[PDB]
Amino acid sequence: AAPVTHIWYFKGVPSRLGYLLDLAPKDLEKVIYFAAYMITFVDEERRT
Amino acid sequence: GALRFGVLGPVRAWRDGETLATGSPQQRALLAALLLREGRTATAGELIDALWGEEPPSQALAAVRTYASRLRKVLDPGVLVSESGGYAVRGLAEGALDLARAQDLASAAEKARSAGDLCHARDLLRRALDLWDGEVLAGVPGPYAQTQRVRLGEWRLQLLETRLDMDLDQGCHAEAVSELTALTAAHPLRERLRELLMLALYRSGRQAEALAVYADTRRLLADELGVDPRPGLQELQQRILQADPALAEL
Amino acid sequence: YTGRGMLFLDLIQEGNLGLIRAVEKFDYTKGYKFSTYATWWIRQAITRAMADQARTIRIPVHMVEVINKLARV
DNA sequence: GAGCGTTCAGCGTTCGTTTATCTCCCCCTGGTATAATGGGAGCTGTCACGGATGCA
After folding, report:
1. SS3 of residue A22 by DSSP
2. A3 touches strand D (CB under 7 A)
3. What are the backbone angles phi and psi of residue B53, rounded to the nearest 5°?
4. Closest C1' nucleotide to C34's CA
5. Cβ-proximal residues to B68 (8 Å cutoff; 6+ apart), any chain
6. What is the DSSP string of chain B?
7. Which chains, if any, share at least 3 CB pairs under 8 A with chain C?
8. Which of B1, B27, C17, C29 is most buried, judging by how many CB atoms fall within 10 Å of its CB?
9. Angle at the Cα of B121 (from B120 to B124), degrees rounded to 5?
10. Residue B141, CB, strand D, below 7 Å
């Protein structure tokens, strides 16, 4: 019903997770396990 | 009210001497298939396979249920139990089945032989053979009944061969030749019956007729199978040819 | 009801379903607190789920109530 | 022809069949009305090596 994330590709050595999104592993632990929010998108043009 | 069952001829049942209407051929097939397990439950799969084999009708299971219900109307309540989705016959007294009655007499006869009571052993075998009211499972359709006809028909012949040996051992040669001529006509390929006949003929002094028995048999087995008689028949032939006195002493 | 083949956090979530049931069937016309009404529904949801989800080979709910009854006696 | 001799015949005559009806327990679901309102709990000590990851 709700998507999940592969344990292999994140939560491992940084040659495989890779920082493909510029986020620390502590940052990732907070967002995907429902402890902190992320701003997935901003209407930066609207705001101006 | 004592139920008795007959399977050594047409499938029959009696209650207090009155003959019960065992029904259609398929019901006799079902009853025989249930009687021969001696109280062990037969699953619905085994009963379908017993009646029709590899080609059952698409609604065969409902037919089996119909036959089972009708047996409950003629048999006493509680003998035909419904268990594990199948049926079993329970609560019969010991020896209520003639097959069991025939089997019990045969086991006692072996003990009587081991105890040396050949006269009682002959009588026990005589009482046993009288239970055959013709062809076992006569007129009963289905593949399962077919296997029992051959298996139990052979067993009758095996008991028959043993009785003649005991009769011949007591010197009753002259009576045995008459019955054996009918038996060899019905069972021409059974070499053991011809072995007993030739020995009986010699002890009845009919050596020339005994040798005549060898000549047709040797030709007949050559004609149908191309085979010589077994060594046991050959040695017995030779002992007549050697005029061995040790065959005539009981 | 922890330590019976169901994880402790899993028990909370199933009981949580019982709570949302209870509020739809509760009203002020009865002169009683919500706490007394709720606990019946919480216990119902937890014990039914325990019957329906603990064992690898599923056992029907009425067989389950039979075996724990005979076990206690 | 006498008297009975074999063998189709189609016809009944219900018994043969499989196929159609119809009555019953496991199994699943819903519901209890005093008040009850944030876990137990099991750990711990090998050893070296390296590279990520934190922080003075």
Report:
1. coil
2. no
3. 70, -140
4. D33
5. B30, B80, B82, B87
6. --EEEE-SSS-EEEETTEEE---SHHHHHHHHHHHTTTTPPBPHHHHHHHHHTT---TTHHHHHHHHHHHHHHHSPTTTEEEETTEEEE--PPTT-BHHHHHHHHHHHHHHHHHTT-HHHHHHHHHHHHTT--SSTTTT--SHHHHHHHHHHHHHHHHHHHHHHHHHHHTT-HHHHHHHHHHHHHH-TT-HHHHHHHHHHHHHTT-HHHHHHHHHHHHHHHHHHT--PPPHHHHHHHHHHHTT-GGGT--
7. none
8. B27
9. 85
10. yes
C30 touches strand D (CB under 7 A): yes
Which two structure tokens, joined as six digits, stand for A37?
Answer: 């929010």
Report if CB C1 to strand D is under 7 Å: no
Proximity of residue C39 CB to strand D below 7 A: yes
**Window 172-191 of chain B: CB closer than 7 A to strand D:** none
d(CA B44, CA C41): 45
CA–CA dist B111, B108 (Å, integer):
5
- Nominal resolution in Å? 3.4
* Nucleic acid strand D within 7 Å of A20 CB: no
Distance CA B145, CA B32 (A): 8
**Cβ atoms B122, B166 nearer than 8 A:** yes
Which residue, B139, B203, B142, is CA-closest to B168? B203
Positions in chain D where some atom is under 7 Å from a protein CB: 15-21, 26-29, 31-37, 39, 52-54
DSSP state letters, C1-68: --SSSS-HHHHHHHHHHHHHHHHHT--TTSSS-HHHHHHHHHHHHHHHHHHHHSSSS---HHHHHHHH
Cβ B33 vs Cβ B42: under 8 Å: yes
> Within 7 Å: CB of B91 and strand D?
no
**Structure tokens of C20?**
């949302």
Report the distance separating Cα B43 and Cα B41, nearest Å.
Answer: 6
**Strand D at less than 7 A from CB of C12:** no
Neighbours of chain B (3+ CB pairs under 8 A): none
Task: Considering all nucleic acid strands, name the nucleotide whose C1' atom is nearest to the C-alpha of residue B139.
Answer: D16
